Amino acid sequence: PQITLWKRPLVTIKIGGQLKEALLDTGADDTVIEEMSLPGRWKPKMIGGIGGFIKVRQYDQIIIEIAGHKAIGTVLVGPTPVNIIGRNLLTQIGATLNF
Amino acid sequence: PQITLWKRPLVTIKIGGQLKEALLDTGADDTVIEEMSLPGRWKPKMIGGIGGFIKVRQYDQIIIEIAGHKAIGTVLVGPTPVNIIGRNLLTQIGATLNF
Numbered sequence: 001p002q003i004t005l006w007k008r009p010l011v012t013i014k015i016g017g018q019l020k021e022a023l024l025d026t027g028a029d030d031t032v033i034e035e036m037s038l039p040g041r042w043k044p045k046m047i048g049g050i051g052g053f054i055k056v057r058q059y060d061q062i063i064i065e066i067a068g069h070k071a072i073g074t075v076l077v078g079p080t081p082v083n084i085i086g087r088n089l090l091t092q093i094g095a096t097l098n099f
Numbered sequence: 100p101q102i103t104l105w106k107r108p109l110v111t112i113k114i115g116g117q118l119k120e121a122l123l124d125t126g127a128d129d130t131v132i133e134e135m136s137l138p139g140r141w142k143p144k145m146i147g148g149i150g151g152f153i154k155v156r157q158y159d160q161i162i163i164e165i166a167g168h169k170a171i172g173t174v175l176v177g178p179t180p181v182n183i184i185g186r187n188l189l190t191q192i193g194a195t196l197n198f
């Protein structure tokens with residue numbers, strides 16, 4: 001699709017069999033989603049945005065569908081205010097910015 | 100142009116007569132720039148992101164040049180760790196996300 005930015009670019013994602021809403025975010029290096037249960041081991045990561053830092057759990061090689069496009073990659077789980085799809089997965093679904 | 104997302108989508112902006120580097124950020128509703136002077140009236144605002152809220156100054160009807168493209172809109176000025184071009188100005192330069 002071609003998505004304009006007059007509204008938030010929200011899409012549905014599917015992860016862990018569940019549907020969630022998430023923001024397509026070119027300003028985010030990584031994908032960050034709210035508290036949920038994921039399989040496997042996790043590693044620590046401390047990620048910074050506006051306001052300061054949060055601690056998150058990093059899960060690698062997680063299967064996730066984004067607007068119907070399959071991706072497999074790193075998902076950070078933590079107390080984010082919104083689910084964010086960052087560049088690590090936007091690149092897997094072939095997203096570009098165009099003007 | 101077509102900007103891929105392998106790296107941060109950083110562009111040069113001109114604002115308040117200054118040159119700055121800024122991130123094209125589809126996950127940002129508003130444009131947020133590090134501390135600088137701008138002419139005219141302003142009012143305070145609180146904006147939240149991953150690590151909580153920061154207080155900014157809201158300046159309306161500011162002209163900015165973004166990667167060569169002129170636009171006008173509201174600019175928030177405050178202690179953001181990175182200059183961010185948000186949807187309120189990305190729409191004006193005709194930016195879209197495509198995949």
Ligand SMILES: CC(C)CN(C[C@@H](O)[C@H](Cc1cc(F)cc(F)c1)NC(=O)O[C@H]1[C@H]2CO[C@H]3OC[C@@H]1[C@H]3C2)S(=O)(=O)c1ccc2nc(NC3CC3)sc2c1
Nearest residue numbers: 027028029030047048049050126127128129146148149180
């Ligand atoms: C969290 C989003 C929902 C909003 N944000 C935009 C994101 O694109 C930020 C951009 C950013 C990049 C950085 F480099 C550093 C930063 F401080 C900020 N991304 C990010 O925090 O990413 C993090 C995480 C992702 O992985 C890595 O990448 C970078 C780091 C790191 C860990 S925002 O900035 O908080 C924002 C902007 C304007 C605005 N307008 C408003 N209007 C009111 C509602 C009416 S509210 C509001 C909120």
Ligand SMILES: [Cl-]
Nearest residue numbers: 171172173187
């Ligand atoms: Cl505006």
Ligand SMILES: [Cl-]
Nearest residue numbers: 004005190193
């Ligand atoms: Cl349009």
Ligand code: NA
Nearest residue numbers: 139158159160
């Ligand atoms: Na003004």
